[PDB]
Design a protein around this ligand. Sequence first.
Ligand SMILES: N[C@@H](CCC(=O)O)C(=O)O
Ligand SMILES: N[C@@H](CCC(=O)O)C(=O)O
Lengths: 251, 256
Amino acid sequence: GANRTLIVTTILEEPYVMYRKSDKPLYGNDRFEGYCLDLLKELSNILGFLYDVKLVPDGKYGAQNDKGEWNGMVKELIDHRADLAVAPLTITYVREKVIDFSKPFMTLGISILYRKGTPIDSADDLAKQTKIEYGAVRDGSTMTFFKKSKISTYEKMWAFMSSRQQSALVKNSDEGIQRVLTTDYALLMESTSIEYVTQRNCNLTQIGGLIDSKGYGVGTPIGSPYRDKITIAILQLQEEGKLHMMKEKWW
Amino acid sequence: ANRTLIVTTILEEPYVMYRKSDKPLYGNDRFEGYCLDLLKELSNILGFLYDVKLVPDGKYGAQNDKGEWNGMVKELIDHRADLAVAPLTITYVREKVIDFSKPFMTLGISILYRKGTPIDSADDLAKQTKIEYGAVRDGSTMTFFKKSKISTYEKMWAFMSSRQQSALVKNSDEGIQRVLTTDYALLMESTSIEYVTQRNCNLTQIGGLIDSKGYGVGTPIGSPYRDKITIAILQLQEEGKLHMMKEKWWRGNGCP
Ligand SMILES: N[C@@H](CCC(=O)O)C(=O)O
Ligand SMILES: N[C@@H](CCC(=O)O)C(=O)O
């Protein structure tokens, strides 16, 4: 019979996945544009699948509690409510306990999103002072990096972000960018995103360099044939310069 | 007193370069660049003096048919240097034989070529004939192509290695000159491409990155400075000092 349509879990994040503006209503995948949708169209054609894009209901990437229970897109994959997660989702060893990733299609690191023309030049500068609040998206890999760090400065930063985490952690990056613009708040954010945001907001900058180095990959349930298949299709797109043309379009 | 460490390195802009002077210079004062600043910062943290020695064959390091290494990799294996502080790519094949610190910079292989052509990818170079292409002989880019099992890259390796490897170049400066003066594209690491295209505005990076790797400080297996260098790199990172060094040596006016 015809191929079962894949369910693709994703999350709203500029410029990876965004709502298309329209006079008329938009249904299905047509609700959506961005780097990840173009990626998905390419993967969809090289491998030949139809797909349904579903936004993760809780709107989170995925972190685990102390009982080993996950949420976000990670959970959607574990529980087979999705075949693939195609989003700016960080490949990490922790998540590899429970899901698979394709090889990476983009590389990145954690850095700071803050405002231009300040004394603040680094992580040490942020941790040491008081007036500027800082944190990360709740239940994403940046928050998890700090929560697990044994590095003395980052441990202090997690204590602060964790010492009332209701003021410091943000539900999403967009919520995150507002505090930046509005309050004295510095947002711990992935460099790919920081790049995009500052080309589009001229009061905003990256601060310091990368504090780590990671990749985004396509997520699958553990053992899925689509993992190796998507690794192969991503290599093809690298060969074709097609991922590069994708990045130039959206950034 | 503490033995002065021997540091193997290689000329490569802007990591390690001869400082300009009207007199000839000696010892460490000969050199400047990102890697010399990194070394100043490492030596303070760990408490050593160092002696900078350019790798005698001017190669980074690759293994021949007989399993024999050359380059800075060989200097380390043979214990002719304590440390390699250079833009030295951390690879699985080198990790079989020397150790590395955590990376201090990340990069990926890409393509340096002239601005204004239709070439936009490795596929486009690999399919055609008119434009010659290759990499620095006995460096990790050459090795990546040499060992690739990916069809496009195997073809590219067959080509750049044909006619007695005439498409390869001895060093990056020779490759950049080759790009500038003939119809030639250089397979080069992105950090280096970024430096070069700001200073040669008729050149550009083609396609994106075709792999993802790091530079790290190389030491012999077992070295009792390896983990201490990693701890220092970590400190430099949190303090923002790596980023400040990168700005010092890369940043300037974008192309008109
Ligand atoms: N890419 C991150 C989301 C954003 C962040 O945590 O900074 C993840 O997969 O969790
Ligand atoms: N960084 C490379 C040299 C440059 C190149 O191979 O493109 C190495 O460690 O061999």
